[PDB]
Structure formats: structure tokens, C-alpha cells
Design a protein around this ligand. Structure first.
Ligand SMILES: Nc1nc(Cl)cc(-c2cc(OCCN3CCOCC3)c(Cl)cc2Cl)n1
Length: 208
């Protein structure tokens, strides 16, 4: 396991999302679902001008896997995925510009639900999650697991867990009081209301 520090502005954003009073937390699902859709758009394209990219799985989709036992909600996509570099730089250093653009817009009329407009929508996961684990596999690199419970740092290690083919799974280890996001009808409700017209199939797994 390697340990890295969040660039100071990214750390300030995460303390903000984690510590600000905002009751409309359900937007986090919309924001993960959009990120997934974007990454699937990206492998779709890269496969037109190259059909070998789908050698790692031709199905382009999004699965929603709640788990009451583990108290996790996992969003999985068969999108482009991230290489070691994307994972490290994106998540922990390069969101610097967007966070500034976002925090600069909050103290200027914006509200938290506008986070994705500045490309930092991933961090809205900290509204319901105490820990986020990201599993990713890029055609060009091996499988990685990124993790953070905030606190100014994150970890990157090689993923021992089952291979996924190509894609990303964001595992949200929910806060004690947000278990309603492990509920079929509640997930169904947020998707219908927020992600109704996503161009890839969204499957909500059932428990047991
Ligand atoms: N589902 C999914 N798939 C991929 Cl390939 C990436 C991500 C993802 C994207 C993120 O940010 C994208 C926008 N910017 C990219 C450059 O770095 C700043 C952010 C983030 Cl932050 C996290 C994930 Cl998991 N999620």
C-alpha cells in the first residue's frame, strides 16, 4: 500500500462536503451514475476507431448493488477505467482547478447540488459515505484499488479482488444514518427522479 496526501484544496472540499449541513444528500447517486455514463461514453468512442478495446467485455452498462450486511452501496460500470496515473492524479491532485472553480461559485450563489458542473461530483459520495473504495481496471494497466476515509490522505494498492474485465466500481461504506440508500424503493426513486434518461442500462440488484 502507498499513502498519498490530497492536494490542499481537494482536502478543503472534502471537509466541506463532510461537515456542511445539507439535507439533500441523494444527489450523490446522480453524480456517480453520471461519472459512470461518461466513462462508458469514452470506451464506446475509443472502440469505433479501434474494436480491440471491447476485447475485455463488449457490454456497456451500470449495476447498482446494495448490501445491507456490509452496509455498502456499490455503483459498477464497464466503462474505460483508470490506469495507476489517472487514479492518483485525477482523484488527488488534478481536481484542484475544479474545486477552486466550485468553492469560488458556492460563495457566489451556488448550492452543493451543483458540484458536478465543476467536475468534482465524485466527492459528493462523502455526503453519505464515511469511506469510499474505488476499484478500477484499464485495458492499458492492471487492476487497482484506491481508498480514502478523508482526513487529508488516500491509499493506492494493487487489486487482489476478483478481476472485473474493464471498468470501475465505487464502493460506498455508508454512514450510520444513511442506510435508506440500501433500500430498493429508495434507490428506484432516486434513479427515476435523477437518472431516468441515461443511455446505458441501469440494473438495480435485489438482495438475498
Ligand atoms: N465511474 C468512473 N469511471 C471512471 Cl473511468 C472515472 C471515474 C471518476 C472520475 C473522477 O473525476 C472525473 C473528472 N475529473 C478527471 C480529472 O481529474 C479531476 C476530475 C473522479 Cl474525481 C473519480 C472517479 Cl472514480 N468514475
Amino acid at each position: 500500500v502507498e499513502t498519498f496526501a490530497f492536494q490542499a484544496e481537494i482536502a478543503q472540499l472534502m471537509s466541506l462536503i463532510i461537515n456542511t449541513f445539507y439535507s439533500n444528500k441523494e444527489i450523490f447517486l446522480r453524480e456517480l451514475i453520471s461519472n459512470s455514463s461518461d466513462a462508458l461514453d469514452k470506451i464506446r468512442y475509443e472502440s469505433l476507431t479501434d474494436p480491440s478495446k471491447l476485447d475485455s467485455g463488449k457490454e456497456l452498462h451500470i449495476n447498482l448493488i446494495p448490501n445491507k450486511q456490509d452496509r455498502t452501496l456499490t455503483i459498477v460500470d464497464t466503462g474505460i477505467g483508470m490506469t495507476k496515473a489517472d487514479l492518483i492524479n485525477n482523484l488527488g491532485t488534478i481536481a484542484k482547478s475544479g474545486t477552486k472553480a466550485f468553492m469560488e461559485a458556492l460563495q457566489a450563489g451556488a448550492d452543493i447540488s451543483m458540484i458536478g458542473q465543476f467536475g468534482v461530483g465524485f466527492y459528493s459520495a462523502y455526503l453519505v459515505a464515511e469511506k469510499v473504495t474505488v476499484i478500477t481496471k484499464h485495458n492499458d494497466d492492471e487492476q487497482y484499488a484506491w481508498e480514502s476515509s478523508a482526513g487529508g490522505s488516500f491509499t493506492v494498492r494493487t487489486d487482489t479482488g476478483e478481476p472485473m474485465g474493464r471498468g470501475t466500481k465505487v464502493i460506498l461504506h455508508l454512514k450510520e444514518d444513511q442506510t435508506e440508500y440500501l433500500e430498493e424503493r429508495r434507490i428506484k426513486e432516486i434513479v427515476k427522479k435523477h437518472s431516468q434518461f441515461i443511455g446505458y442500462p441501469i440494473t438495480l440488484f435485489v438482495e438475498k
